[PDB]
Amino acid sequence: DTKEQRILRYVQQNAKPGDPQSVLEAIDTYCTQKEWAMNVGDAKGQIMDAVIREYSPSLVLELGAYCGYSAVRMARLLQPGARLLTMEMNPDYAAITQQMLNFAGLQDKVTILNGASQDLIPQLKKKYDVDTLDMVFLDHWKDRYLPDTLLLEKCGLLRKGTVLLADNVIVPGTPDFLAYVRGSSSFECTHYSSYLEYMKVVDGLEKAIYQGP
Ligand SMILES: CCCNc1ncnc2c1ncn2[C@@H]1O[C@H](/C=C/CNC(=O)c2cc(-c3ccc(F)cc3)cc(O)c2O)[C@@H](O)[C@H]1O
Ligand SMILES: [Cl-]
Ligand SMILES: [Mg+2]
């Protein structure tokens, strides 16, 4: 048995089927009264919600699905016809994310891509029929935010106005990523101070809007 399986089971037993909000609530409740887990969480999730609503992205890429909390959170706010692609290298977690999304009734808005971002990103145009991304949410291994951002650029997947939203830029921290988007003329950046999921440790998200090269 694993922590991720317990979280799924808790949602399946307590949340309301086909109700994405009840899924988020049940995951938060589990993590608030039982085992901590690395979901973006409710505080940072409010900022995520705000960004999704403001920019109304038709195509979103998520790096790092984990239990699918962020996938549920973004997907539930997407406009009809809009789509989310989520990359997850761990097949156990990909399987959990799929069951979470199924439960939430969001399976038709989300496609889970299995594998590591550095290998999937270069297949997006040919294999998954992507032109450009409107939004990217980064929440995978922290030392990979910068390399994956450069890879997305190199592959021609960013357009002017593409919104990158990055979790955990303070804790655990993505100092290299921040130095890059804040120093580069190719991004205009806005920092959102909040709190780490399920506690009062200060963390934040960085919003970095691609300007073109
Ligand atoms: C080298 C491969 C990089 N490419 C990748 N491609 C696809 N999926 C990837 C992935 N890397 C990681 N993943 C997956 O993303 C998820 C990993 C996320 C890493 N997250 C964290 O480390 C993290 C950690 C904390 C944390 C904060 C404070 C603390 F004391 C302890 C932990 C808080 C967070 O909000 C976090 O997001 C997993 O599901 C993993 O399988
Ligand atoms: Cl929270
Ligand atoms: Mg995170």
PDB file of all heavy atoms in Angstrom, residues 85-86 110 213:
ATOM      1  N   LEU A  85      -2.770  18.815 -21.093  1.00  0.00           N
ATOM      2  CA  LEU A  85      -1.869  17.682 -21.216  1.00  0.00           C
ATOM      3  C   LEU A  85      -0.969  17.648 -19.978  1.00  0.00           C
ATOM      4  O   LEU A  85      -0.369  18.672 -19.646  1.00  0.00           O
ATOM      5  CB  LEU A  85      -0.982  17.837 -22.429  1.00  0.00           C
ATOM      6  CG  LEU A  85      -1.602  17.963 -23.824  1.00  0.00           C
ATOM      7  CD1 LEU A  85      -0.481  18.180 -24.842  1.00  0.00           C
ATOM      8  CD2 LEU A  85      -2.461  16.714 -24.162  1.00  0.00           C
ATOM      9  N   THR A  86      -0.881  16.494 -19.328  1.00  0.00           N
ATOM     10  CA  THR A  86      -0.084  16.324 -18.147  1.00  0.00           C
ATOM     11  C   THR A  86       0.904  15.199 -18.294  1.00  0.00           C
ATOM     12  O   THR A  86       0.539  14.058 -18.656  1.00  0.00           O
ATOM     13  CB  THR A  86      -0.917  16.241 -16.834  1.00  0.00           C
ATOM     14  OG1 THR A  86      -0.001  16.327 -15.727  1.00  0.00           O
ATOM     15  CG2 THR A  86      -1.820  15.010 -16.766  1.00  0.00           C
ATOM     16  N   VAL A 110      -8.570  16.082 -20.223  1.00  0.00           N
ATOM     17  CA  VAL A 110      -7.172  15.876 -19.818  1.00  0.00           C
ATOM     18  C   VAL A 110      -6.580  14.680 -20.518  1.00  0.00           C
ATOM     19  O   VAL A 110      -7.235  13.648 -20.622  1.00  0.00           O
ATOM     20  CB  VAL A 110      -7.085  15.715 -18.298  1.00  0.00           C
ATOM     21  CG1 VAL A 110      -5.626  15.530 -17.847  1.00  0.00           C
ATOM     22  CG2 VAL A 110      -7.710  16.954 -17.638  1.00  0.00           C
ATOM     23  N   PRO A 213      11.383  35.559 -28.880  1.00  0.00           N
ATOM     24  CA  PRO A 213      12.868  35.619 -28.764  1.00  0.00           C
ATOM     25  C   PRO A 213      13.463  36.993 -29.058  1.00  0.00           C
ATOM     26  O   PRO A 213      12.845  38.002 -28.724  1.00  0.00           O
ATOM     27  CB  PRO A 213      13.361  34.604 -29.810  1.00  0.00           C
ATOM     28  CG  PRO A 213      12.225  34.476 -30.815  1.00  0.00           C
ATOM     29  CD  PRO A 213      10.942  34.874 -30.119  1.00  0.00           C
TER      30      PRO A 213
END
